[PDB]
Amino acid sequence: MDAPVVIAGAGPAGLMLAGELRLAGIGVVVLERLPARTGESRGLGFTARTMEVFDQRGLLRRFGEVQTSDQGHFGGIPVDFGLLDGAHQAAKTIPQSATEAVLEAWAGELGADIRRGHELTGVRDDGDGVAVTVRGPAGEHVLRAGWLVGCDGGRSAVRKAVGFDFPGTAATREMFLADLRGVELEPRSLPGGMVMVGPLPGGVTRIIVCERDAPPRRRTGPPPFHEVADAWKRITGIDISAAEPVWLSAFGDATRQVTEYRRGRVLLAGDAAHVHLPAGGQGMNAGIQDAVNLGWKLAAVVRGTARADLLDTYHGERHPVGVRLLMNTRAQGLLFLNGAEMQPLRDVLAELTGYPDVARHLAAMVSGLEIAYDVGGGSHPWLGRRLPRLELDRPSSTAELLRPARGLLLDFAGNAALRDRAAPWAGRIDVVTARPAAGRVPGATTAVLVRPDGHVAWAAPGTHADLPMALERWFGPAPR
Amino acid sequence: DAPVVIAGAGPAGLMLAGELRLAGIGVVVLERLPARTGESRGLGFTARTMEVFDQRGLLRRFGEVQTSDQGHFGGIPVDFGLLDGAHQAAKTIPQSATEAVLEAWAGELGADIRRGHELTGVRDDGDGVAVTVRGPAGEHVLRAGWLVGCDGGRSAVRKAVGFDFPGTAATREMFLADLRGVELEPRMSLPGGMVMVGPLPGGVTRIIVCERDAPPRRRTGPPPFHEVADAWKRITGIDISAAEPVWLSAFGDATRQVTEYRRGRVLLAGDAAHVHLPAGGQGMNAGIQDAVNLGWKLAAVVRGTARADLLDTYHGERHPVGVRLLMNTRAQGLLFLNGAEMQPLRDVLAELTGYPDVARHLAAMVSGLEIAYDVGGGSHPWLGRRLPRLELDRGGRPSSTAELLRPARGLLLDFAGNAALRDRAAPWAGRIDVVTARPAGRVPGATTAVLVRPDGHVAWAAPGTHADLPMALERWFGPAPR
Ligand SMILES: Cc1cc2nc3c(=O)[nH]c(=O)nc-3n(C[C@H](O)[C@H](O)[C@H](O)COP(=O)(O)OP(=O)(O)OC[C@H]3O[C@@H](n4cnc5c(N)ncnc54)[C@H](O)[C@@H]3O)c2cc1C
Ligand SMILES: Cc1cc2nc3c(=O)[nH]c(=O)nc-3n(C[C@H](O)[C@H](O)[C@H](O)COP(=O)(O)OP(=O)(O)OC[C@H]3O[C@@H](n4cnc5c(N)ncnc54)[C@H](O)[C@@H]3O)c2cc1C
């Protein structure tokens, strides 16, 4: 055994997963094909939920001051996100290159074995372990591990070598993205195609080129600038061929998702599990959020404290999130790429987005705060959902207590009787008697059991199963 | 020869002819077809269309009409009951029956309806119109003050005056088949295309075939049934080739609208003015409602009582409505025809329909109750909008605003028995009816009086209208020395 867990890929997903595992004292080897981070800006910022999970690991202070923005929108149609509490899109200026840099520094200091320059070329499941063929700076060797996780992007080697079913719709077009230095472009339903224009920090202009009736090309592959410039000039009639390319990329509208996130001792996360239209503002957030769901569960299984059905909750909870992720990205794409044939439907929708019922509903889709797992029956509003950041009188917060990434039993009523019911699971969770003071708290909530990912598994009152059942379910068997 | 000539005796033509006859305007209607073909086409009509029929006492010519709060937008079910009076009506009554009601009503009102007469040309003589028609005898020329084109989407009148007809061309072809002798279940998202199945009274089944990637075809005749059956089987897997076809037809999704509803002394109404994807449930309702807007205004012009800007309010009011019409049908059409590539958008919208704000909005678009004309400034809720039917205490007799609007003359409703404002409307006596009556209340706020156009829309109301009553009266019912 070279490590309990091997992760292929050091993007946002793999790096977050490595951090989540290391927090739980698990040994993890990360295989990254690239010798360094690309430094691609890609998307700017991340959703409210992603900001919340960073805060749960004390990673927010590492970005400096982030700027919130309730200026959200859906498929080009402007929507107010302030109508739903805390759904504000955030970090609108923080590029993925910076987020990757923060995460890789975080994983490394935690003891992640990040081996850059190593490419996964093969994998077989021994049933009781996984054999991983690797190509590194010396040559081709073989690592073996308890579990393999594929966080190796949309072209995932792991996915193909294990034989995951990857259904969906193929690409119907090609689009261009270009960050440009040296042109004055104004932030804009013309024929020939659609175009988006926006500014970036440091005098950089970001353009999106979606020409009408453009064919989907398999790329290696950064696009040649002149090909992007001619596509642009064909649509807008503005010559930009004398600009300076900061970064160019080509992408398709292909959307696919693995039928199962788990095959034996091999799991998938991020773009490896779900691929979709990159310019939709959800991908990185989905990969980081997949990693936070799986990390503490995979950790418990390795330690042997987990119940036999825990690891399967990764697929159980995250696959529906992925389905809804593809629906969201596909729907927004239609309102974006298609020309005037989609305009009447764009208009009808634009007439509905003023109604606060609609605004809140669309905001919850994008922010990712609508995410609600099935964790059992109960009338409590938090059950299966994220625990919102509460500030506790003890001077700590729920986000701060979740930094070690262990389960929390929060005791608000100072009840000695339920603290004794939790006794067998001592060492697996922390019992914290404190007073909520932030503090959106429903009805007469006296206690709440919080999963390491921040999701509420149980809550008094309003949960069918009682505390010992919820504890056994999410934190494993304990002789009683 | 004729004060007005209408080309076409479908819903738009017949309704307009009736609206003119009510005003005493002599009108000749030209219909190329010797007899009705018997196309059921659509079933039922919208709430607003029901309301305008009630305004002329035409509802009881159908029998009893059945309302339904079960609305739909692009297939997605919507509760129309959340908006008062927006219920779909007559869901069993075919357009052929509605046409038959309107023709008898026109004929009894004195309308000169000439079937077997096809319009072939028109020159606008600056102050008159010369119409060339080929009837039973042969070619002959009619001279008229006004020619209204209600001759359908392939309007000969539109093409002969040179209206601009901008829009989008057809992208596909689709079939309609009224069949007998097949047991077919109504569906509740296939590849190869989509399909609709619905029952029709008389054990007749109605199917819509929309095969994926079918090329648009311009054909004058009906499609052969073997072509509709082979498309159907390609999509569903069910063989219907042994069916008996009542009616077969083929349509495209071309949507165009004339830039101007009026060119000199030639006007357009119905599919002549705006064509779209027939699957939306709006066309006939829009055509009939165009005819109601134009009729009384054109009558005022013929009688020389109209203000010089009244006739242009036909284009002014009905063109934007026609734009909404193309948006509505096209948006809905996308939620029907496109296969699994539209499904994510269908799903999202389906989640929103449950919100009463949304349901009410879509219900207004489809029912026609959203229609609001710019008639002037004011904070009064009814201003420029349709006057809802109000039960009234007429002296000591029960009445209704619908009943009062039957003669198709303007109304000044006095709720508070005020004879001061009853003298402000004195000059326009013989043009409107001043009615002192008491409504239920249903009236918004402290409404004391309301001026109603012959088409049912409120032109002025006290309080909450910037203009004065004499100003509003001059604007809609003509100049009067004072
Ligand atoms: C132009 C653009 C704009 C975007 N904007 C946004 C946005 O605003 N918001 C948002 O949430 N998302 C956005 N995204 C999507 C986001 O960038 C990706 O979804 C995110 O990177 C996915 O994380 P990942 O770790 O799973 O995949 P990856 O980032 O691709 O990480 C995969 C890593 O694994 C490595 N790898 C691949 N194969 C192997 C192998 N065989 N062996 C070893 N290593 C391997 C790769 O080198 C790579 O570094 C955008 C994407 C694009 C292209
Ligand atoms: C399959 C189908 C289903 C539909 N379902 C619905 C529905 O559920 N609800 C709804 O509101 N609408 C529906 N519609 C639309 C509705 O049928 C039309 O919009 C409606 O007929 C428009 O009325 P119109 O008078 O302007 O046109 P038309 O009904 O077509 O009348 C035009 C008349 O002018 C005559 N004409 C043509 N050329 C000449 C000429 N040169 N000289 C003299 N006369 C001429 C024609 O013979 C015809 O009688 C449907 C349409 C189709 C095709």
Q: Which residue has the tokens 């402000």?
A: B424
Start-end of H helices in B126-237: 156-161, 225-236
Q: Is the minimum CB–CB distance between B352 and chain A shorter than 8 Å?
A: yes
Atom in ligand 2 nearest the alpha carbon of residue B249? 1
Sign of torsion over alpha carbons B462, B464, B469, B474: negative
Residues 6 or more apart whose CB falls under 8 angstroms from that of B131 comprise: B5, B7, B30, B119, B121, B122, B141, B142, B143, B144, B147
Does the distance separating the beta carbons of B331 and A351 come in below 8 Å?
no
Q: What is the resolution of this structure in A?
A: 2.7
Q: How many CB atoms lie within 10 A of CB B184?
A: 18
Residue A271 labelled as part of a binding site: yes
**Which residue is closest in CA terms to ligand 1's atom 52?**
A278
Nearest to A358 among B335, B345, B358 (CB): B358
Does the distance separating the beta carbons of A352 and B358 come in below 8 Å?
yes
* φ, ψ dihedrals at B245, nearest 5°: -85, 110
Q: Which residues pair with B344 in a beta bridge?
A: none
Does the distance separating the beta carbons of A334 and B342 come in below 8 Å?
yes
* φ, ψ dihedrals at B464, nearest 5°: 100, 35
Interface test mutation site (partner B, options A79, A324, A348, max chain B beta carbons within 10 A): A348
Architecture of the domain defined by A374-480? 3-Layer(aba) Sandwich (3.40)
User: CA A329 to CA B212: how far, in whole Å?
Assistant: 24
Residue B229 labelled as part of a binding site: no
Nearest to B344 among A331, A342, A357 (CB): A331
Sign of torsion over alpha carbons B342, B348, B354, B360: negative
Interface test mutation site (partner B, options A169, A347, A352, max chain B beta carbons within 10 A): A352
Report the separation in Å between the CA atom of B32 and the middle of ligand 2, taken as the mean of its atom positions: 13
Q: Is the minimum CB–CB distance between B330 and chain A shorter than 8 Å?
A: yes
DSSP structure class, residue B466:
S
- Structure method: X-ray
Nearest to A357 among B171, B348, B355 (CB): B355
* φ, ψ dihedrals at B149, nearest 5°: -90, 105
Q: How many CB atoms lie within 10 A of CB B81?
A: 17
Our mutation pick for probing the ligand 1 site, out of A97, A284, A365, A366, counting the most ligand atoms within 8 A of Cβ, is: A284
Q: Residue A57, CB half-sphere, CA atoms under 13 Å: how many?
A: 31
* CA proximity to A450, closest of A415, A399, A416: A399
User: CA A247 to CA A254: how far, in whole Å?
Assistant: 22
Interface test mutation site (partner A, options B189, B352, B366, max chain A beta carbons within 10 A): B352
Domain B1-172+253-373 has CATH 3.50.50.60: yes
Q: Residue A256, CB half-sphere, CA atoms under 13 Å: how many?
A: 19
Helix/strand/coil (H, E, C) string of chain A? Answer: CCEEEEEECCCHHHHHHHHHHHHCCCCEEEEECCCCCCCCCCCEEECHHHHHHHHCCCCHHHCCCCCCECEEEECCEEEECCCCCCCCEEEEEEEHHHHHHHHHHHHHHCCCEEEECCEEEEEEECCCCEEEEEECCCCEEEEEEEEEEECCCCCCHHHHHHCCCCCEECCCCEEEEEEEECCCCCCCCCCCEEEEEEEECCCEEEEEEEECCCCCCCCCCCCCHHHHHHHHHHHHCCCCCCCEEEEEEEEECCEEECCCCEECCEEECHHHCEECCCCCCCHHHHHHHHHHHHHHHHHHHHHCCCCCCCCCHHHHHHHHHHHHHHHHHHHHHHHHHCCCCCHHHHHHHHCCCCCHHHHHHHHHHHHCCCCCCCCCCCCCCCCCCECCCCEEECCEEHHHHCCCCCEEEEECCCCHHHHHHCHHHECCEEEEECEECCCCCCCCCCEEEECCCCEEEEEECCCCCCHHHHHHHHHCCCCC
**Which residue is closest in CA terms to ligand 1's atom 2?**
A42
Do A15 and A99 touch, CB atoms closer than 8 A?
A: no
Which chain A residue has its CA at the smallest distance from B340's CA? A169
User: CA B43 to CA B285: how far, in whole Å?
Assistant: 11
User: CA A198 to CA A221: how far, in whole Å?
Assistant: 24
H or E element in which residue B337 lies: helix B313-337
Report the separation in Å between the CA atom of B228 and the middle of ligand 2, taken as the mean of its atom positions: 22
Helix A283-303 with A48-55: angle, nearest 10 deg: 40
Residues 6 or more apart whose CB falls under 8 angstroms from that of A18 comprise: A7, A10, A28, A30, A107, A110, A112, A114
Shortest CA gap A339–chain B (Å) = 12
Do B335 and B186 touch, CB atoms closer than 8 A?
A: no
User: CA A121 to CA A119: how far, in whole Å?
Assistant: 6
> Any long-range contacts for B464-468 (C-beta under 8 Å, 24+ apart)?
B464/B378, B464/B379, B464/B380, B464/B381, B464/B383, B465/B376, B465/B377, B465/B378, B465/B380, B465/B383, B466/B376, B466/B377, B466/B378, B467/B376, B467/B377, B467/B378, B468/B424
Q: Is the minimum CB–CB distance between A352 and chain B shorter than 8 Å?
A: yes
- Report the DSSP pairing between strands B4-7 and B27-31: parallel
* φ, ψ dihedrals at A95, nearest 5°: -75, 155
User: CA A56 to CA B157: how far, in whole Å?
Assistant: 72
Residues 6 or more apart whose CB falls under 8 angstroms from that of B441 comprise: none
- Discontinuities in chain B with C to N beyond 2.5 Å fall right after 188, 440
Shortest CA gap B217–chain A (Å) = 19
Which chain A residue has its CA at the smallest distance from B169's CA? A341
Question: B-chain residues within 8 Å CB-CB of A213?
Answer: none
Report the separation in Å between the CA atom of A275 and the middle of ligand 1, taken as the mean of its atom positions: 10
Residue B284 labelled as part of a binding site: yes
Q: How many CB atoms lie within 10 A of CB A397?
A: 18
Domain with CATH 3.40.30.120 in chain B: 374-482
Question: A-chain residues within 8 Å CB-CB of B331?
Answer: 344-345, 347-348
Residue A42 labelled as part of a binding site: yes
Q: Which residues pair with B256 in a beta bridge?
A: B167, B275
Do A299 and A352 touch, CB atoms closer than 8 A?
A: no
- Does the bond joining B463 to the residue before it have cis omega, within 30 degrees of 0? yes
Do A457 and A474 touch, CB atoms closer than 8 A?
A: yes
Question: B-chain residues within 8 Å CB-CB of A334?
Answer: 341-342, 344-345
Which chain A residue has its CA at the smallest distance from B360's CA? A352
b/e per residue A321-341 (b: at least 16 CB within 10 A)? bbebbbbbbbbbbbbbbbeee
Domain A1-173+253-373 has CATH 3.50.50.60: yes
Do B31 and B114 touch, CB atoms closer than 8 A?
A: yes
Nearest to A347 among B327, B341, B351 (CB): B327
By the 10 Å C-beta count (0-12 exposed, 13-18 middle, 19+ buried), B254 is classed as: middle
User: CA A402 to CA A400: how far, in whole Å?
Assistant: 5
A282: Cα separation from own chain's centroid:
7
* φ, ψ dihedrals at A241, nearest 5°: -65, -10
Using CA atoms of A106, A112, A118, A124 in order, give the dihedral in degrees to the nearest 10.
Answer: -130
Which chain B residue has its CA at the smallest distance from A170's CA? B341
Does the distance separating the beta carbons of B355 and A361 come in below 8 Å?
yes
H or E element in which residue B152 lies: none
Q: Is the minimum CB–CB distance between A328 and chain B shorter than 8 Å?
A: yes
User: CA B297 to CA B293: how far, in whole Å?
Assistant: 7
Domain with CATH 3.40.30.120 in chain A: 374-480
- Report the DSSP pairing between strands A204-211 and A255-257: unpaired
Do A274 and A322 touch, CB atoms closer than 8 A?
A: yes
Domain with CATH 3.50.50.60 in chain A: 1-173+253-373
Q: Which residues pair with B27 in a beta bridge?
A: B4
* φ, ψ dihedrals at A312, nearest 5°: -70, -15
Q: Which residues pair with A250 in a beta bridge?
A: A176
Q: How many residues does chain A have?
A: 480
User: CA A126 to CA A145: how far, in whole Å?
Assistant: 10
b/e per residue A121-159 (b: at least 16 CB within 10 A)? eebeeeeeebebbbbeeeeeeebebbbbbbbbbbebbbb
Sign of torsion over alpha carbons B414, B420, B424, B427: positive
Shortest CA gap B187–chain A (Å) = 23
**Which residues 138-177 on chain B approach chain A with CB closer than 8 angstroms?**
168, 171
**Which residue is closest in CA terms to ligand 2's atom 29?**
B10
Question: B249: helix, coil or strand?
Answer: strand
* Cα-based distances in Å from B69 to B112, B313, B420: 39, 33, 43
User: CA A123 to CA A143: how far, in whole Å?
Assistant: 10
Which chain B residue has its CA at the smallest distance from A327's CA? B344
Do B213 and B191 touch, CB atoms closer than 8 A?
A: no
- Report the DSSP pairing between strands A266-268 and A140-150: parallel
b/e per residue A5-28 (b: at least 16 CB within 10 A)? bbbbbbbbbbbbbbbbbbbbebbb
User: CA A223 to CA B472: how far, in whole Å?
Assistant: 65
Angle at A359 between CA A353 and CA A362, to 5 degrees: 100
CATH fold of B374-482: Glutaredoxin (3.40.30)
Ligand nearest to the CA of B249: 2
Give me the amino acid identity at A4. P
The alpha carbons of chain A give a radius of gyration, in whole angstroms, of 23
User: CA B480 to CA A252: how far, in whole Å?
Assistant: 68
Which residue ranges have their beta carbon within 6 Å of ligand 2?
A: B 7-13, 30-33, 41-43, 95, 118-119, 150-152, 156, 176, 249, 251, 270-272, 278, 281-285, 287
Task: Measure CA of the first residue to CA of the last residue in chain B; give whole Å.
Answer: 36
**Which residue is closest in CA terms to ligand 2's atom 22?**
B284
Which residue ranges have their beta carbon within 6 Å of ligand 1?
A: A 8-14, 31-34, 42-43, 96, 119-120, 151-153, 157, 177, 249, 251, 270-271, 278-279, 281-285, 287
The alpha carbons of chain B give a radius of gyration, in whole angstroms, of 23
Using CA atoms of B7, B10, B16, B19 in order, give the dihedral in degrees to the nearest 10.
Answer: 140
User: CA B289 to CA B291: how far, in whole Å?
Assistant: 5
User: CA B254 to CA A453: how far, in whole Å?
Assistant: 53
User: CA A359 to CA B120: how far, in whole Å?
Assistant: 54
Our mutation pick for probing the ligand 1 site, out of A31, A96, A276, counting the most ligand atoms within 8 A of Cβ, is: A96
DSSP structure class, residue B185:
P
By the 10 Å C-beta count (0-12 exposed, 13-18 middle, 19+ buried), A29 is classed as: buried
Interface test mutation site (partner A, options B325, B330, B336, max chain A beta carbons within 10 A): B330
Q: Where are the beta strands (DSSP E) in B292-347?
A: none
Domain with CATH 3.50.50.60 in chain B: 1-172+253-373
* Cα-based distances in Å from B38 to B53, B98, B198: 22, 11, 19
User: CA B47 to CA A472: how far, in whole Å?
Assistant: 59
User: CA A130 to CA A128: how far, in whole Å?
Assistant: 7
